[PDB]
Amino acid sequence: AIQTRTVINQHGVSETLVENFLSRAALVSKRSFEYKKNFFKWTINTRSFVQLRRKLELFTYLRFDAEITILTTVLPDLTLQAMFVPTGALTPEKQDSFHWQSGSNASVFFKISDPPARITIPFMCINSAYSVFYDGFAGFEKNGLYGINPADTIGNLCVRIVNEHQPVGFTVTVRVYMKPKHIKAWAPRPPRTLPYMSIANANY
Amino acid sequence: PTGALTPEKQDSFHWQSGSNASVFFKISDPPARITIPFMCINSAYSVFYDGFAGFEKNGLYGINPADTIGNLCVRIVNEHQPVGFTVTVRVYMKPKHIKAWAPRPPRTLPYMSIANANY
Amino acid sequence: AIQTRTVINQHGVSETLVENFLSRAALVSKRSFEYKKNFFKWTINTRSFVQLRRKLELFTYLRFDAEITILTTVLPDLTLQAMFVPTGALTPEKQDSFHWQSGSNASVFFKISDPPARITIPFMCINSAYSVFYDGFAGFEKNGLYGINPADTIGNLCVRIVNEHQPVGFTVTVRVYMKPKHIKAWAPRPPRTLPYMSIANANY
Amino acid sequence: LKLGNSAIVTQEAANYCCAYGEWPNYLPDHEAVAIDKPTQPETATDRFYTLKSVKWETGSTGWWWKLPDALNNIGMFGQNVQHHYLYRSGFLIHVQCNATKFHQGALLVVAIPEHQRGAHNTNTSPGFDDIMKGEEGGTFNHPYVLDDGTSLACATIFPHQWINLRTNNSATIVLPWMNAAPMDFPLRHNQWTLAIIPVVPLGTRTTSSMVPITVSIAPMCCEFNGLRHAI
Amino acid sequence: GVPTYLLPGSGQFLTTDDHSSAPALPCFNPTPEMHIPGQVRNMLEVVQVESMMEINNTESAVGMERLKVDISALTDVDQLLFNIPLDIQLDGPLRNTLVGNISRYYTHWSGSLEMTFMFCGSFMATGKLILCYTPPGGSCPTTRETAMLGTHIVWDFGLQSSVTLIIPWISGSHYRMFNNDAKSTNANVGYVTCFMQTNLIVPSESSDTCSLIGFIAAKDDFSLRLMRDSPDIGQLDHLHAAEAAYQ
Amino acid sequence: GNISRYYTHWSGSLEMTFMFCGSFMATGKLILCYTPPGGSCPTTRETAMLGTHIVWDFGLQSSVTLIIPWISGSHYRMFNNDAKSTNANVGYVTCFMQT
Amino acid sequence: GVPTYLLPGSGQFLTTDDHSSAPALPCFNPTPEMHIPGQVRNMLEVVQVE
Amino acid sequence: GVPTYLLPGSGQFLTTDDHSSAPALPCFNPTPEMHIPGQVRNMLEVVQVE
């Protein structure tokens, strides 16, 4: 209930640049699973949290890179794998599937006593920029999901316990972080104020 | 910092907010270290404030609204485990790039509170 | 069932070079064993996985290096050894054999809390290039194994638990990775489409 | 505007306000895709395809169109949508109404790129017939929120002009090629979304003043894929 | 070998750090750029573009009735029309503007503004109005006479339907100063009022009702600092298809 | 068709070639008609001539060269499940009996 | 890669050390200085006053 | 001694990385090359053949 003021002298302009307007590396997914479906698969869609969804939808087209950092909390020497799978190749469905043994996709291997892993993914959209809002139809026949671009796909990561079935049981918690770099945006758009109702489209 | 809200429960959605700074570190590691720049909205911190924060008469005499910095929150990241434990936390603060003004004589009579000067 | 297109502008030629066509470091062997035959011996043959066998047999002669990385998942302070044994010297057959004490062959020593070990092996073929397909006979008398070159050998690694017999028992899982470098190939050959039936020869 | 076959005459010149800064520019220095010898007809498209006249009553709430959609049916550009699948074109929009000096009201011509629509109070995506209207165009059900949850109060970030019935009765907006890919498909993608929104409704002594509003569209510099080849 | 040792702060993970990384797919060439029109490089290239506010501030104004106010030739003698508190973070005539949605992300703001009005009456209609500014010290004016003693302008209808007003300076912060989770409201700054100089003159043909629309646009001295999150949406609502990727 | 299986995105121009192996006394004319990726395949001889068509006989040359202008392609994993989105139909290379 | 090894005294934490650190809020510009009168630079400028 | 600290992503093992290594048999000279005819350097020198 106290109303005060302060005179403010400023000269900074480069604080509001778009490159460090989006370099904050917020969290994008938090899910735990067990092992005694014994893994974790997650599409790399971006509109999962409303703190990041509204902040991203100010623009029309943009172009950046991933900088994915997986943080793991959960024991004798747990080794984990995060096999990236892009489009064109198939996704694993069981823990000992032969898609794990495939070399044609990228993979990491890391412990728990180590600091958590870090990779980055370049711009893999087949257009020149990501399409945030898609004003058309993916397909020719009438029932097409209005607002899904086939160029909007990125891939999906899969997290798996490497070790043998041990006589102890445990539960692994996985968090993902994503830091955009080298930002170039176009055509600014007004924000959405009415609350979201789904993740597939804009309804209210 | 100021402007954003503080968490009140361990699984609050203020923890999931990205708009504030955060660190993540283990116990086998050496302990963490950050530094915070000068965030006072004046040109210098006001140690002794000879006025009132507010217009109506009951204002806490000697609290500058520019004197705020923020507050840190320390949280166990892990799941509820079938063991229980107790965590001890210590903080250290090292001032750098010092510029002072207008020296004042020290206080010899002992303090009685933390909010003001009484004896 | 959705049929879409995208115009594609490209200028990259150096993506399809042979040096980074084969630099992907796929997995080549996965075997676990126990300790309470108490070790692991493996010849360094290359045609063990069909993801790598068909990918390798496009050519006639090639020349590269190994870059062997052994990844170990399995405890008080386990120390492991990977004694390389080339041709000319004899292979160990028991855990406490005196071929382990021989210094004339290369060896490593490493823990489990460490990051996993890494070595590389130069070109040890006594010809100028490896012979993928051998159109002849190793030997003079009639029963020779048609398609085994005596220059095709490399060696074999042996993995052994260093520690004493402890009152606990355990099981060690060993994985191998191989990354070819400095690639020079010759005389390209059409791929095989009909499925393999054995590892010693080409049958269908 | 004596352009090609037609000429919309007797208009206030106003301003050829470019959208951001640009021109259709004929797309040079691209040889890594669409090497099919683009035909690029120019003098066979510039006609000023006019639309159906609409009626703006007191309780009216606006209209909207899609630019690659509404021209699929009419003219030489309507034929060239079929037996072709790649194109690139810039547009010209001429919006003009008419009234007496005794009416009063305000309109707002605005053009949005990649304007994804939505439905009210459901969880089902809109159907194929809820988008592909064609020439006649559709109607806003909730104009204050633009049927996507975005506020109309911030909608002046797009290129726009203010038709004010006290001052003027015309507007002209030039749109360049706004797309991620250089060339695109007509039957499943619409880049721009032309829409008009009444802000202040009309008023007179009688009722049912029509105020007929006419929109004319003309492609500036179009091109297509290849159709004729040696071998 | 070189001799090394570790600092306190090894092995940690900041959220605002900046270091190089390892590429997941090396020797992968992205598609090159293109001259896409309408490029932005600085967030201040949005609030400099004009946008409308909500003049009709009273209750029961649902929908697009907040964007306009009506004066009557029936009865409008000397009464007040509207007033604008210059508080961005508070609800009112400036809540859901263009600058009222970017500045929610930040904490401290300072700069000058520019308001614009556009009258949309008939061509035969006349009438004079008055716009009076208020310094941030005192209170809002009540009558027509007491409002003239501030910075006031006299604007009619027959010559120009447009007018330009310059706001000299604003400021603002949030001031978390207590011990508890409290919200210290910022101080009241300025008033932008409008009174009726003369009653409306219409001919016998047209309608006897006119309209007003107020615009707003920030200048090139408007600066921002200390980006935070915005409470504009809410925590969460019920999502229909909450999980797609996981399953 | 065996190298491009290893990759995902392809773009370029091609070249088809035919080689007729009849007797030295044998004659006869044929026709090769190209189809743009928009429409459908031709059915009769007359409707195929309206595209890019060539007329090739036997007695003069037993060889012929045809240039494909452009192809493209991808795989388009866009759903939520393990689905295979088929690429769109592009082109037809037909051959009818002139004589 | 370069070859490295550790000293005795790694991972410790002195109280009078001096090394660089990580900024918690990078790209945050503080308010600039001002000529505030009565600046002191050395503690011996107090005991010289009577 | 020089002052050092670690990044997130230490001790990991990528599958597409590129760093130097330790030779298992140093001071071992391989057999030299030879002008073997029919050398290929780019995979596009196959699909150009009919």
Side-chain angles (χ1 to χ4, degrees), chain D residues 86-157:
Chain D
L86 288 175
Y87 71 102
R88 182 178 183 270
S89 63
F91 292 96
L92 190 146
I93 297 170
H94 181 75
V95 176
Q96 184 176 3
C97 66
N98 50 358
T100 63
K101 293 182 176 67
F102 295 100
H103 299 90
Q104 58 89 31
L107 298 177
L108 179 59
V109 176
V110 71
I112 303 168
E114 295 291 328
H115 179 74
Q116 181 178 1
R117 294 180 63 86
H120 175 71
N121 197 1
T122 183
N123 291 319
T124 302
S125 67
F128 183 76
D129 293 332
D130 294 332
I131 298 300
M132 295 299 171
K133 298 298 290 183
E135 181 181 0
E136 295 178 354
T139 306
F140 292 100
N141 290 318
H142 296 285
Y144 183 77
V145 302
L146 295 173
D147 291 333
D148 58 349
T150 63
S151 295
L152 187 145
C154 301
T156 59
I157 193 65

Side-chain angles (χ1 to χ4, degrees), chain C residues 113-126:
Chain C
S113 297
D114 295 328
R118 175 185 289 266
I119 57 171
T120 184
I121 297 170
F123 180 73
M124 295 193 294
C125 178
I126 52 177

Side-chain angles (χ1 to χ4, degrees), chain G residues 13-39:
Chain G
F13 170 71
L14 274 73
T15 57
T16 61
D17 54 352
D18 193 2
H19 294 285
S20 65
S21 296
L25 292 175
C27 296
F28 180 76
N29 297 116
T31 64
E33 295 181 355
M34 192 181 72
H35 184 273
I36 297 168
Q39 185 177 0

